[PDB]
Amino acid sequence: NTNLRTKTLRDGTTAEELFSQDGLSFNDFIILPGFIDFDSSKVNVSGQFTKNILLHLPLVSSPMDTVTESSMARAMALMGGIGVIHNNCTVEQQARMVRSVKLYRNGFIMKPKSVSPDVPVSTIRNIKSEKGISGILVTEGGKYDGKLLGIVCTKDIDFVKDASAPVSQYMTRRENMTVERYPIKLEEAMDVLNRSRHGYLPVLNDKDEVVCLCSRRDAVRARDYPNSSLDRNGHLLCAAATSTREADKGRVAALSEAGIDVLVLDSSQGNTIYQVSFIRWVKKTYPHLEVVAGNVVTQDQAKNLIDAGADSLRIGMGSVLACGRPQATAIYKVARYAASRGVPCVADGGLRNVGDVCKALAVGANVAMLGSMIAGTSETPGEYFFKDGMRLKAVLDKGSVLKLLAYIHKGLQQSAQDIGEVSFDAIREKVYEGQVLFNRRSLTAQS
Amino acid sequence: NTNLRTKTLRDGTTAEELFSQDGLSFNDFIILPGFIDFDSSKVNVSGQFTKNILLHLPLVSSPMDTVTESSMARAMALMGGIGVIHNNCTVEQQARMVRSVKLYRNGFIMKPKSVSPDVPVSTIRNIKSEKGISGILVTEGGKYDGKLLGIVCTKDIDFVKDASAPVSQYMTRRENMTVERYPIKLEEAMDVLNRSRHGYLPVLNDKDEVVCLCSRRDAVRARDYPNSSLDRNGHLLCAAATSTREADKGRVAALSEAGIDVLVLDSSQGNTIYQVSFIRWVKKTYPHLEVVAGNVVTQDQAKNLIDAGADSLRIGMGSVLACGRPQATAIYKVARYAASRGVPCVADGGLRNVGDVCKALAVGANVAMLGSMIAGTSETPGEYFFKDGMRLKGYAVLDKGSVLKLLAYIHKGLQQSAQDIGEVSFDAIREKVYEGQVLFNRRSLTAQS
Amino acid sequence: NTNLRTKTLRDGTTAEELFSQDGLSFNDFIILPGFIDFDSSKVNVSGQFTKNILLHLPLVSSPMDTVTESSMARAMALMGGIGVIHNNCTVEQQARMVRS
Ligand SMILES: Nc1ncnc2c1ncn2[C@@H]1O[C@H](COP(=O)(O)OP(=O)(O)OP(=O)(O)O)[C@@H](O)[C@H]1O
Ligand SMILES: Nc1ncnc2c1ncn2[C@@H]1O[C@H](COP(=O)(O)OP(=O)(O)OP(=O)(O)O)[C@@H](O)[C@H]1O
Ligand SMILES: Nc1nc2c(ncn2[C@@H]2O[C@H](COP(=O)(O)OP(=O)(O)O)[C@@H](O)[C@H]2O)c(=O)[nH]1
Ligand SMILES: Nc1nc2c(ncn2[C@@H]2O[C@H](COP(=O)(O)OP(=O)(O)O)[C@@H](O)[C@H]2O)c(=O)[nH]1
């Protein structure tokens, strides 16, 4: 239906004209509708977080100590986005959070949590309550590669009152265990696990030592979250923030060991000599890492940071107070310039509802960073408390971040539908082409 | 430490003097502190819901269609309180909600949900998704008492791609199942279940027909909720509301069949001839049922409804109609009169924070009814939605999260208040209030800032 | 680092264009960021109060009778600025404040 979808009258204003005068926020303009011949279910909202990482869900959790720790990053990656673990912590704590995110979901679990036979049941209960993993292997000397002696699961210890008893008293013992022998393809191993009606399947060598471990929970997670952002080994994608000082070099190394796939530079004004040097050093020393430089708001800053070797750009400054730029103009300008050079952009700031996120993605941003919009969800750091009959964490309880991410997803889909394009890549292309049009709204026209 | 706890100077105002003038609400007065020689954890907040039903947690969910359905009543019963299933529904819907509450927790599971071998996996998934029960028995002709053929659990069908496949293809077959033979004591059966590391244990006769079923989930529910309000058969307590018209008689019967333990009469002004007749008829026809009459706010009304045979009274009227009464005065007066006659009372209305609940319990109410305070928790009826960057509930209110966390918060608050007052139980607080050893101070309008 | 500091794309609006239309207050505009290769400690904020007087601190206390007398002028001069003693007084009082 290209004859019906193609605008020839072009009654409206193109992005280039809209952003050619004064700096705009998202309320200053609206997107005009197009032609619909599809359901909102079929809309692809995906966007590039970096040159090589495509997110099924163009949403990134902001690296604030009040928003993104291991739990938030896990939720984001599971729903098809990603989270940036904040850097307001020691290097070891940040690496531990990254490791939690990366080893939450696996195919073969290579370093399965293991204990020695004399460990008390209390310790396994602590592991399950704190780290949330069951099917703890009991091996010679507790080494994750030692001889397999048994396994401890939920129903093996849920009835015992003496929490100091050794696991050897209640574990399922090796002689009675369904196991597999190295080597084995993940497909066959997991189908065997399914047929076995058990929750775990260790994989051992010829010496009965633990090679790895398969978990039914990973299969069920794959079934319940088919769009999770994953690496090539089946782990959830994870990003981590860092400043560009010389000390932070150490930090970077640690994160690289923990397995981050994206490094995000933390700066209000990223067009500095220190950030340029840092990006060069990161791309040289850890080529496998992708770097999101920023923050920037003008095309000059973007030119410098892209020349340095940035894989993506963080847009935002102001969304004492004498330096910055209205956020919608910043996004349009920087994202257009960066796209001309093949670099996607992240919108960071002033994104307070679904209409704003949609506008920010339409005017050039590939993905959007969420801070306030997801603050107070169950997955954020912090403790809940009651006050005035409201439950707060301060901000009000917004429940699960997963339900909110699904809400934002449906909102973006319906908006793209009304605009008349079945994907946001198409929306951005047609915006640059002048086939998706806008209207600036007078101040009165805003209600 | 009776020398230190016993007030002889008695610097303060007794409840009788406090409520002797104009009608008061809860902000008009404060409770004076006493003597502390115990930690707040050791405080017993329990109160009588009726002549025969004691609640470890003196909280009742209000029978409003926006507050109490099966899920809320279950949560309340589990935390040591109770819920009243609302009556803004058909008799069949109310009985179904009551059944949901009553059969959630069991010892021996009677009439275990079972299916025939040709049933598709889709049906088992539907059972798990709607009603929330696993371990479906597969029997001769699907009869809950037929010959046992197998069992279908979570891990038996979580991997299957053809939801139309028969359960017999993936069920665990009877020859491989750990089972027990009638008769068996629940204690031995549950220890067997524990040792077996399985989730379910059927109990069969000599013909391999299903007699009953034990669920490990019940053991874990008992472990995680040790204070659950239970009847004598191990089921959660459940209450249900009804009006006092002639038609509602039918309703009562149905609810009685569903297994309610308390009937609650719904009326803004319960001192009527219709309610008196209804209470007489209920106590006559269903002696096993306990009735909470109301609503009332004066000792006249309380006399009539207790003479009718009420086992408890709901206090509250007004918390444009010109008739009602300030809630704290109403509670004190009616609860004092009813206690003189051996009947506990429920405070219903104007309860908006924990201090008000503590005050209402101290001045005579045995338990407190919560409506607004718990509306918008996850367990209430209604659908969640996002609006203006806020999570709300609709058929609007703000999301308060889990009602369980809220109930625990109220529990800790009541305990700390009782500690500051200097008594280790709320029965003690009520007794000492009537005795003049727990004292109050009326607050001037200025003193409330 | 002149290659990195020098704007060639010039994505933004020059002062001449900004002030070419209607009269603006300070909230009507914002300054765009540039390139950083130094610490804020090294920034020179000095400005000429007059053709021959350079102030290390480009701040002047207003000559209002509620703001600037001898003490304020002293504080300003000491911190690198200057103060203007108000003229809502006799000549002798103003001269005495100046002398102080
Ligand atoms: N490979 C195995 N061989 C034999 N028995 C096993 C094996 N793995 C687990 N078990 C036993 O079966 C039961 C495991 O159930 P499961 O793995 O589903 O527990 P979980 O992962 O902790 O979560 P949940 O049981 O609540 O679904 C336990 O009794 C355990 O001892
Ligand atoms: N009495 C029994 N005898 C033999 N097998 C049983 C018995 N009860 C349950 N099973 C089987 O145990 C295996 C694992 O149980 P499954 O995890 O699927 O459900 P569950 O025991 O209720 O625990 P959960 O649903 O939390 O995982 C299933 O194949 C189930 O059919
Ligand atoms: N037994 C078991 N181990 C898991 C599972 N999932 C992940 N693991 C592993 O458990 C380990 C937990 O981290 P660990 O190094 O033991 O603790 P830390 O030193 O405090 O970080 C990780 O190495 C994970 O790979 C599971 O489902 N079962
Ligand atoms: N298989 C199984 N049945 C249960 C369990 N818990 C309760 N039940 C029984 O399952 C039945 C629920 O289905 P049912 O009431 O017969 O259907 P309804 O008439 O439409 O409400 C009840 O008889 C419960 O007693 C459980 O854990 N497993």
Tab-separated table of C-alpha atoms in Angstrom, chain A residues 27 32 41 50 69 75 133 199 227 236 276 279 289 298-299 318 325-326 339 365 396 405-406 419 444:
chain	number	residue	atom	x	y	z
A	27	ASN	CA	6.030	19.379	24.797
A	32	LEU	CA	1.478	14.029	12.802
A	41	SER	CA	1.373	-5.991	18.034
A	50	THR	CA	25.772	0.618	20.470
A	69	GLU	CA	21.850	-2.517	40.777
A	75	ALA	CA	14.916	-7.182	34.919
A	133	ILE	CA	20.043	-20.080	43.633
A	199	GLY	CA	15.466	-29.356	38.411
A	227	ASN	CA	13.327	-11.595	24.176
A	236	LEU	CA	22.231	-11.616	30.111
A	276	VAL	CA	39.021	11.128	24.737
A	279	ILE	CA	38.053	5.968	25.154
A	289	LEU	CA	34.170	-3.736	25.050
A	298	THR	CA	26.228	19.460	20.594
A	299	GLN	CA	27.645	18.015	17.392
A	318	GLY	CA	20.163	19.998	31.933
A	325	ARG	CA	20.667	22.574	25.933
A	326	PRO	CA	16.929	21.843	25.599
A	339	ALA	CA	23.854	8.594	12.514
A	365	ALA	CA	17.517	8.441	19.592
A	396	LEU	CA	6.108	5.986	45.659
A	405	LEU	CA	8.426	-2.034	30.847
A	406	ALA	CA	5.589	-3.951	29.189
A	419	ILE	CA	2.316	7.399	13.116
A	444	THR	CA	-1.717	27.700	24.384
